[PDB]
Design a binder for this molecule. Structure first.
Ligand code: TO6
Length: 328
């Protein structure tokens, strides 16, 4: 059978918390006044929610209203409990209220509004200094939620809201987030394809916070190399092949051998043999202003097959890549 794995940090945070903290199925939702919020414009629709810009008529302030699609009350209470546990943390989106929508007959989560810069304009215009700054702001949110016993499991550009005018960042959409419990096996059908960690792609279920650090590495690679997404697989199988053409197949075998994992035999015809590449190969005249030795070493230390070998969020904040970022 597979070899078990534990997070190397924050391993026991939920065991020493009171049970109420992580036993989300027992959570009693405190409902606000649904008439306090008037929907203004539809912002988006996802797999699990519709998102609206609204006005809170008790203060005439903008808010975001996320009307959940019908799913299991467990998944709904999970997201609510996580949002309440993390409220006030650095760069965590703030849950302001929870109301019962009378049309959907589901909960509507009400959040602080972030006046977000569209991700196209952001991606094409962020400078080297901007990228280090906002990576550090994401790391603050990830170290916070990890320190609080929670992994996000859906880190990707669309879930990082940036108000570039105020240099304000918020990590959003906690609907896939989970509590980390040592030894627990989790669903591997989390994250968007391009940001799925190797552990998910080889069906290793006993993963942890380090999954978020692979996703963060994928974002960093796309930003400094100006290729979005960086690992651009056609499906979940081709996704692992794309990764192995960069990190090499020998270290992939070392990884699955360490955890006594077996690859899906359908990889036999598609995986091939691939050397590990040096990150400099991805540097060219149109991205070199975004690349430094520090950037490449930091990236190299996030994108490891072995989830146990990646930088933790706190270790990442110690990296020389952030030495030039002004600290407050
Ligand atoms: C999809 O889950 C979430 C989404 C959001 C916010 C947005 C979306 N989608 C959004 N779109 N445009 C904006 N200015 C904002 C904000 N703030 C906040 C919390 C969530 O859990």
């Amino acid at each position: 059978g597979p070899v078990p794995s534990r997070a190397r940090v924050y391993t026991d945070v939920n065991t020493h918390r009171p049970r109420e903290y992580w036993d989300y199925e027992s959570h009693v939702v405190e409902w606000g006044n649904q008439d306090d919020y008037q929907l203004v414009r539809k912002l988006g629709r996802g797999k699990y929610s519709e998102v609206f810009e609204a006005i809170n008529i008790t203060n005439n302030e903008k808010v975001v209203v996320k009307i959940l699609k019908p799913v299991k009350k467990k998944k709904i209470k999970r997201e609510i409990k996580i949002l309440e546990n993390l409220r006030g943390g650095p760069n965590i989106i703030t849950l302001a209220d929870i109301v019962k929508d009378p049309v959907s007959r589901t909960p509507a989560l009400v959040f602080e509004h972030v006046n977000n810069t569209d991700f196209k304009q952001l991606y094409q215009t962020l400078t080297d200094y901007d990228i280090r700054f906002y990576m550090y702001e994401i790391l603050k949110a990830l170290d916070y939620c990890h320190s609080m016993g929670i992994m996000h499991r859906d880190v990707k550009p669309h879930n990082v809201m940036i108000d570039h005018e105020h240099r304000k960042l918020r990590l959003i959409d906690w609907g896939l987030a989970e509590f980390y419990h040592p030894g627990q096996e989790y669903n591997v059908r989390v994250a968007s394809r391009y940001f799925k960690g190797p552990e998910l792609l080889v069906d290793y279920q006993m993963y942890d916070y380090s999954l978020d650090m692979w996703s963060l590495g994928c974002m960093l690679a796309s930003m400094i190399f100006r290729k979005e997404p960086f690992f651009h697989g056609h499906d979940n199988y081709d996704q692992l092949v794309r990764i192995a053409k960069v990190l090499g197949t020998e270290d992939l075998y070392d990884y699955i051998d360490k955890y006594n994992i077996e690859l899906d035999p359908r990889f036999n015809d598609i995986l091939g043999r691939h050397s590990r590449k040096r990150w400099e190969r991805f540097v060219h005249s149109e991205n070199q202003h975004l690349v430094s030795p520090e950037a490449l070493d930091f990236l190299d230390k996030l994108l490891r097959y072995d989830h146990q070998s990646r930088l933790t969020a706190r270790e990442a904040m110690e990296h020389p890549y952030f030495y030039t970022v002004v600290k407050d």
